[PDB]
């Protein structure tokens, strides 16, 4: 279920924290990989693991959420006043860094679709949990992929206007951003975002484009219920892999999960229900 480590043991399993095994300041603090011996916990098979130093009830909490598409909790250390926790390591790392590259040509339809259904089946588990887990925006680094381009969502669970908008790059619901309302409504919106860029391969938000494309989702909108102008948001390096029918419907899931209206959305195993035929 849940590994208790010690600090000791988390040196031996990241190299005494080295720079090596650094792979980057997240949302909540560092992240460390490391690995796990077969000998290091009793129960835990051996497997690359990634450590996350925080900048508990909750956690007991957290270890409870079991799923294929959530990235497993592992363990957790709690040592003088440091606070981190032991995930699963997700070998090919964050959607975005395959998503937005040139070519993506490890991402074909196919792959994108198996890849939005299990992001949907997560976000589903978590809506319908004991109690809701809901993100403060799903964004595109919220799913990681392991090594079968698998989707598992990461950091699940863990104001004012200015503050609210400040730094946002699309994902953010409408109705959070204006009022701070947050329901499980609000991930239906990041996702429904993330959902344009695998049909696109375009980031939500791109200052580099030309004004009128600078967001993906106010340009794509008008181009959603137009099947024969559909081509013009669809990712050019999946020509010939889709149908128009295939392509028309990915974009009217994503169409009702972008609506400015949160009860206009689905709920999340709809989502599920809608895109597994396509695939
Ligand atoms: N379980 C994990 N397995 C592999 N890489 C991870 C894992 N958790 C986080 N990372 C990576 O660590 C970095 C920072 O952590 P995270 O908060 O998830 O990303 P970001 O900085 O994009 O918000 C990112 O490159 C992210 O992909």
Same mark, same amino acid.
Request: charged share 25%.
């Given at each position: 279920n849940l590994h208790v480590f010690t600090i000791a043991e988390l040196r031996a399993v990241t190299r005494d924290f080295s720079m090596t095994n650094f792979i980057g300041e997240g949302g909540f603090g560092p992240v460390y990989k490391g690995y796990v011996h077969?000998?290091?916990?009793?129960?835990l098979a051996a497997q690359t693991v990634a450590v996350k130093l925080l900048d508990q009830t909750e956690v007991f909490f957290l270890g409870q959420?079991?799923?294929?598409?959530l990235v497993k909790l592992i363990g957790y250390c709690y040592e003088d006043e440091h606070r981190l926790l032991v995930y699963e390591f997700m070998?090919?790392?964050?959607l975005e860094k395959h998503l937005?590259?040139? +070519? /993506? =040509?490890?991402?074909?339809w196919s792959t994108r679709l198996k890849i939005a259904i299990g992001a949907a089946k997560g976000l589903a588990f978590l809506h319908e949990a004991e109690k809701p887990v809901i993100y403060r925006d799903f964004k595109t680094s919220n799913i990681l992929l392991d090594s079968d381009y698998k989707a598992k969502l990461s950091d699940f669970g863990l104001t004012h206007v200015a503050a609210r908008v400040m730094?946002?790059?699309? +994902? /953010? =619901?409408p109705e959070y951003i204006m009022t701070g309302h947050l329901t499980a409504k609000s991930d239906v919106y990041g996702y429904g975002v993330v959902l344009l860029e695998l049909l696109?391969?375009?980031?939500?938000?791109?200052?580099?484009?030309p004004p009128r494309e600078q967001s993906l989702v106010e340009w794509a909108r008008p181009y959603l219920t137009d099947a024969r102008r559909l081509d013009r948001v669809?990712?050019?390096?999946?020509?010939?892999?889709?149908?128009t029918r295939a392509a028309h419907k990915a974009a009217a899931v994503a169409h009702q999960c972008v609506?400015?209206?949160?009860?206009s959305r689905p709920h999340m195993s709809a989502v599920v229900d809608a895109l597994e035929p396509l695939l």
């Open positions: 077969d000998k290091t916990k009793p129960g959420l079991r799923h294929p598409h070998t090919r790392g964050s937005f590259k040139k +070519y /993506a =040509a490890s991402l074909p730094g946002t790059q699309g +994902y /953010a =619901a696109s391969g375009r980031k939500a938000v791109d200052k580099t484009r669809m990712d050019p390096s999946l020509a010939g892999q889709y149908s609506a400015l209206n949160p009860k």
